Structures are given as structure tokens and as C-alpha cells.
Specification:
The PDB classes it as oxidoreductase. With about 325 residues, the protein is mainly alpha-helical. The protein has helices at about 40-45, 60-70, 75-90, 145-160, 165-180, 190-205, 220-225, 250-255, 285-295, 300-320; strands spanning about 55, 95, 185-190, 260, 270. The protein is globular. Bound molecules: a molecule of 7 linked components (NAG-NAG-BMA-MAN-MAN-MAN-MAN), a molecule of 5 linked components (NAG-NAG-BMA-MAN-MAN), protoporphyrin IX containing FE, alpha-damascone (A1IUA) and magnesium ion.
Length: about 325
């Protein structure tokens, strides 16, 4: 009949570097029913047992895993986790698939809500990723070797064979151009516009070993290990400080860009959206997402309503800090 969802964990007691690829967290191959998805971070944590190996977890487990495994900053973990859960998780059972649909999240919610996992396109997951192809081409979750080859190419061209912040600036823009030219349904606004810049620096701030203090750069072996094999590098030590999206500002500055999309189902037809969230208008993202939640849950009652209210509030606690102050919305009132 359902779960009473606890408030998110706070920051880890210990925030220094440590060995995360350790004896208690061995890489293991997928079993039947194991779920993986578009996030290499969560994929790696599942394949090393920081998350349940089946790829279905509670928000709390996801937060603690991103902190333990990678030293993902607490508020960043809260913003990402409850966004993913509100849109893509089962709020009654308190379970989120890090990939596609699975019986493991329990009894489905009332449509149009789906609990279909992070694979679901269009509000969270979106286009112009680094190692995953746009949903328009048929597969938004699998590793794509051609895209990784371009990652390697750009690292060779701008990063001395390593992925660093200069590479990120160039790759991000080029991937936007690929999608403009080839994807008639290309959207790059709202959540996706914001998350697309952060994801390009996560490899630098989080996938680079934490003992490397200076000239942080990711090797292609380590990139392949994580992005393709869902495997931590041997002897991997997490970031020495809580981190998230440091440097995302510089990635945008290298090639200034404006939220929007290809209009009228045509390539090479990018039109700007002036209503979208952007980096100086972050609270729009909060309002947009609360709107999206109302579309998914038009008239909840009982445990569903209760859990919506709590998750919405938990999300806001993170958003309020991360976005520098947003007025809390109460689409379902109070408990
Ligand atoms: C991601 O990874 C990539 C790849 O590793 C990395 O790229 C490095 O980025 C740094 C910058 O952050 C680069 O270093 C800088 O290079 C600048 C450009 O250098 C060229 O021009 C120099 C200036 O020449 C003057 O004089 C000549 C006359 O000789 C004149 O014609 C010119 O017009 C100009 O006026 C030149 O000196 C330099 O050539 C020297 O070095 C090369 C070896 O690379 C050698 O072949 C030459 O014989 C010569 O010895 C080159 O052609 C440069 O301007 C800049 O200099 C500043 O800093 C130094 C030291 O800090 C100061 O002494 C100086 O006053 C300047 O303020 C600096 O050296 C580096 O080259 C990149 N490496 C590669 C491989 O591309 C990214 O940074 C990484 N990103 C992140 C975020 O980490
Ligand atoms: C892994 O991910 C890769 C990269 O995203 C996928 O490959 C892409 O696949 C799409 C769809 O097949 C390709 O899109 C098509 O591009 C054509 C233009 O290609 C030229 O230009 C690009 C660069 O601008 C070059 O890279 C490329 O080699 C060519 O020289 C267009 O003509 C196509 O458009 C037609 O159809 C659309 C849709 O209906 C219409 O709207 C158009 O008007 C038009 O008629 C189309 O967009 C794309 O080029 C591929 N990129 C690369 C780099 O290969 C893989 O599919 C995927 N791998 C697997 C197995 O999943
Ligand atoms: C905290 C909860 C997390 C959630 C809910 C989450 C969710 C997602 C989703 C949905 C995507 C797909 C992006 C898209 O196609 O638009 C994504 C991509 C990504 N995530 Fe995560 N993520 C989380 C944590 C992390 C962590 C801790 C890291 C790094 C350790 C990470 C690294 C990445 C990277 C690099 C990508 C880009 C993949 C690519 O474009 O090839 N994420 N994440
Ligand atoms: C998976 C990525 C999440 C993000 O980039 C977050 C959002 C949604 C906005 C501000 C930055 C950050 C908290 C990292
Ligand atoms: Mg994507």
C-alpha cells in the first residue's frame, strides 16, 4: 500500500578522498532484469554495488551513493535526484529506475504518470549528449561508439589526448551543431539546457581521480571504462572535495548559446525560446518542473498526494540553495 519517504541524507560525515573501487564494491556483470540507463555515474555505482545492482533505488540510496562513490555535492545530489524521482519515479513505493520501465518499481502510478525511469525522454533526459545519441534516432540510453570516437577526437584536438575544460567547451557546442543539422525534433531548453552544461564538467570534476590536484584531465581509458563499461578505474579515488558543476559557466562562455529547438520538424532551423530557463533565470526551471509534475499528477489523493507533497518539498530544499532562492510552490497544498 506504500512507503513513508524519509528526508534526504545530508552531506557525508567524511568529505575527503578515499578508495571507492574497493573489495566491498567489486564490478560485476549484469544479471537478467538489471537496469542501466543514460547516466554513467549511476550506472557505475550500480555495477559496483554502491546502488542496488538491479538499478532500482530509493532517492535516499541514490543520494548516499553519489556522495559515497564520487563525492557529489549534497545539494546537487538533492536537485538531480528528486527531479528524476518526481518525473520518472514511483512516489508511492519510493523507487526510481535509473534506466527504463521495470516491474521492480512496483504497481504503476495513474497515467499520465509512468514511473518509467531516467530513460524517459523530453522533460529530464534530452539531446546533444556526449556518449548517448538523441532519442529521435531510436536509442537515448545506450553507449554509442561513434559519439565516443568524437569525444576522443576532440580530446586529441583540444586537450593533448585528454578530456579537460577546453575540450568540454568545444565538444558541447559541436554536439549541439550535430543535433541541429541531423535531428528535426532537437530540443535544447528548460531542464536539458541547464543539465547539458553540468554534464560536460562532471567527467572533469568527478571522474578524474581525487589524488590529482592540478591540471585535472580525464584519460580516454578511464572515460571508456566509466561511459562504456560502467566500471571505476583501478584503484579509483573519489574527488577530495564535494563537487558538481564547477566550470560549467566557462563551457557556456566558450560558445555562448541560447535555449531553443529546431522548429517545424526541420533540421537547420533552430529558433530561440525566450521563456526557457537559463543560467541567469534558474527559478524558471523550478516553476517549469512543478508545472510538469502537475501534468503527470492532475488530481492525486491519499498516500500519492502525501508523498508528492513531501518529495516536492525535499526537492525545493535543494533547489532553494542551488538556484540562490526560489519561492516554494504548493500545487497540492500542505500535509
Ligand atoms: C587542456 O589541455 C590542453 C592541451 O594540453 C591545454 O592547452 C595548453 O594551454 C596552455 C594555455 O593555458 C598553452 O600554453 C600557452 O601557450 C600560448 C600560445 O603559445 C604560442 O605562442 C607563444 C607566444 O609567441 C610570441 O612570440 C613569437 C615569437 O617567437 C611571436 O611570433 C608570436 O606571435 C607571439 O607574440 C609561443 O611562446 C609558444 O611557443 C613556445 O612553446 C612551444 C611549445 O608549445 C614551442 O614550440 C615554441 O618554440 C616556443 O617555445 C606558442 O607557439 C602562450 O601564449 C602562453 O604563454 C603564456 O604563459 C606563459 C607561461 O605561463 C608565459 O610565460 C607567457 O608570458 C604567456 O602569458 C602559454 O604558454 C599550451 O601551449 C597548451 N598546450 C597544448 C599542447 O596545446 C589546455 O590549457 C588545457 N585546458 C585546461 C583548462 O587545463
Ligand atoms: C550512434 O550515434 C550516431 C551519431 O548520432 C548515429 O549516427 C547518426 O545517425 C543519423 C541518422 O541516421 C544521421 O543523420 C542523418 O544525417 C544526414 C547528414 O549527414 C551528413 O552530415 C553529417 C554532419 O552534418 C555527417 O556526420 C554525415 O556523415 C553526413 O556527411 C541527413 O541527410 C539525414 O537527414 C535526413 O532525415 C531527417 C530525418 O527524417 C530529415 O529531417 C532530413 O531533412 C533528411 O532528409 C540525417 O539527419 C547522422 O549523420 C549520424 N551521425 C554520424 C556522425 O554518423 C548512429 O545511428 C548511432 N549508432 C547506433 C548503431 O545506434
Ligand atoms: C544524483 C543523481 C543523478 C541523476 C538523477 C542523474 C541523471 C542523469 C540523466 C537523466 C542523464 C542523462 C542526460 C540526458 O540525456 O539529458 C545523466 C547524464 C550524465 N550523468 Fe548523471 N545523474 C546523477 C548523478 C550523476 C553523478 C554523481 C555523475 C558523475 C559521477 C553523473 C554524470 C553524468 C554524466 C557524465 C552524464 C552525461 C552522459 C553523456 O552525455 O554521455 N551523474 N544523468
Ligand atoms: C545530472 C545533472 C544535474 C545538474 O546539472 C544540476 C541542475 C539540475 C541544475 C544546477 C546544477 C546541478 C545542481 C548540478
Ligand atoms: Mg540524452
Amino acid at each position: 500500500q506504500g512507503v513513508d519517504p524519509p528526508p534526504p541524507p545530508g552531506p557525508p560525515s567524511f568529505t575527503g578522498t578515499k578508495l571507492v573501487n574497493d573489495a566491498d564494491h567489486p564490478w560485476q556483470p549484469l544479471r537478467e532484469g538489471d537496469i542501466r540507463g543514460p547516466c554513467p555515474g549511476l550506472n557505475t555505482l550500480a555495477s559496483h554495488g554502491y546502488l542496488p545492482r538491479d538499478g532500482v533505488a530509493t532517492p535516499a540510496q541514490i543520494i548516499t551513493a553519489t556522495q559515497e562513490g564520487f563525492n557529489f555535492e549534497n545539494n546537487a545530489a538533492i536537485v538531480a535526484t528528486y527531479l528524476g524521482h518526481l518525473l520518472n519515479g514511483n512516489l508511492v513505493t519510493d523507487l526510481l529506475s535509473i534506466g527504463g520501465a521495470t516491474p521492480k518499481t512496483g504497481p504503476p502510478p495513474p497515467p499520465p504518470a509512468h514511473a518509467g525511469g531516467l530513460n524517459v525522454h523530453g522533460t529530464f533526459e534530452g539531446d546533444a549528449g556526449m556518449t548517448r545519441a538523441d532519442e529521435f534516432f531510436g536509442d537515448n540510453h545506450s553507449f554509442n561508439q561513434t559519439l565516443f570516437d568524437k569525444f576522443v577526437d576532440f580530446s586529441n584536438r583540444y586537450g593533448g589526448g585528454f578530456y579537460n575544460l577546453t575540450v568540454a567547451g568545444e565538444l558541447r557546442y559541436s554536439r549541439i551543431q550535430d543535433s541541429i543539422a541531423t535531428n528535426p525534433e532537437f530540443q535544447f531548453k528548460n531542464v536539458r539546457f541547464i543539465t547539458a552544461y553540468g554534464e560536460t564538467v562532471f567527467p572533469i570534476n568527478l571522474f578524474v581521480d581525487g589524488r590529482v590536484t592540478t591540471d585535472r584531465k580525464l584519460s580516454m581509458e578511464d572515460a571508456a571504462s566509466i561511459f562504456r563499461d560502467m566500471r571505476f578505474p583501478d584503484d579509483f579515488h573519489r574527488s577530495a572535495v564535494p563537487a558538481s558543476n564547477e566550470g560549467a559557466d566557462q563551457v557556456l562562455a566558450a560558445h555562448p548559446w541560447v535555449p531553443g529547438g529546431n522548429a517545424d520538424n526541420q533540421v537547420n532551423n533552430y529558433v530561440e525560446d525566450p521563456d526557457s530557463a537559463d543560467f541567469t533565470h534558474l527559478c524558471r526551471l523550478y516553476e517549469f518542473v512543478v508545472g510538469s509534475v502537475q501534468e503527470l499528477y492532475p488530481n492525486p489523493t491519499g498516500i500519492l498526494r502525501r508523498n508528492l507533497i513531501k518529495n516536492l518539498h525535499y526537492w525545493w530544499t535543494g533547489v532553494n540553495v542551488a538556484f540562490g532562492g526560489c519561492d516554494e510552490l504548493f500545487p497540492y497544498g500542505q500535509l
